Amino acid sequence: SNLVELEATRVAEKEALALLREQAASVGTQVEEAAERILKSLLAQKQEVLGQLRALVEAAEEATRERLTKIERQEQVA
Amino acid sequence: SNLVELEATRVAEKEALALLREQAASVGTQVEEAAERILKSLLAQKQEVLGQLRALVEAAEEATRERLTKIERQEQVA
Amino acid sequence: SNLVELEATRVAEKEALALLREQAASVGTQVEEAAERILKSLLAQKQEVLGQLRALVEAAEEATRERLTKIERQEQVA
Amino acid sequence: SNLVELEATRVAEKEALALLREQAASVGTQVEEAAERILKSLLAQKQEVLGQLRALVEAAEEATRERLTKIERQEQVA
């Protein structure tokens, strides 16, 4: 039956495209998600390291204020 | 006194704090610039890639459109 | 207490250079770990993506070959 | 149909699979390359950041050193 041979062909072409669409949309997906999961760990790197940098500076800023209030007194006695 | 020594200490201290602020803020920058370049070039990938899959699927889709038309007409005739 | 704050001071100093390498080496560490984690996940993508593309091409190639096998037969009948 | 519509379809089907092969290998290319940019820009970061950090520690040590050559002298006078 040619109405069947050809129907067989339509269906198989449709299934071949459907498979291709879902393999493409999966690369789409696999790619959008690697980005999300990279972007996240990355802007988390940043508001972690930026934190521990601001802290290094707070400490240093305290050791350096300690040091000046010591000088400030010994200059009043000088 | 050596109020000359004390004052010279106050100012070596301030310069050493200042230098340390600059180095630290500068490290802040390198870090933000990394994350910015990385975000930009990941968003270029994502856009380029999706656009190339869009292509691949629409070419694929049009090869099918044609294939099915040879079938549509050959069923008129069958 | 002649020399007691000429020491109580060096023990605030000793204790704060130390804090500062503990902060500085820990900052370089966060950068390192974040670089590893980001590569570890680019590579995961690259593999999972290269492989899903390979599978899309393989299925396409099999379809195409099924197409020519059909053509080649109707050429024996032609 | 004819040997001639049959050869033309062989042909269009090769031009379709060829195209698909380009577009796909080229999505691969687009993925690999972004991954190399992100690697490069991480290296440049991990360079300049481990650099600037090393410097900041060697200035805060150059100056812990000065701060103790002074203490050592004032202890000889005490």
Curated annotation (Swiss-Prot), chains A, B, C, D:
Disulfide bonds: none annotated. It is found in: Cytoplasm. Residues 1-78 form a coiled coil. Induction: By interferon. Disruption phenotype: High susceptibility to DNA virus infection, such as lethal herpes simplex virus-1 (HSV-1). Cells are defective in CGAS-mediated type I interferon IFN-beta production upon HSV-1 infection. No susceptibility to RNA virus infection, such as influenza A virus. No visible phenotype in normal conditions. Belongs to the TRIM/RBCC family. Interacts with STING1. Interacts with TICAM1. E3 ubiquitin-protein ligase that plays a key role in innate antiviral immunity by mediating ubiquitination of CGAS and STING1. In response to pathogen- and host-derived double-stranded DNA (dsDNA), targets STING1 to 'Lys-63'-linked ubiquitination, thereby promoting its homodimerization, a step required for the production of type I interferon IFN-beta. Also mediates monoubiquitination of CGAS, thereby promoting CGAS oligomerization and subsequent activation. Independently of its E3 ubiquitin ligase activity, positive regulator of TLR3 signaling. This is E3 ubiquitin-protein ligase TRIM56. It comes from Mus musculus (Mouse). The chain holds residues 225 to 302 of 734 of the full protein.
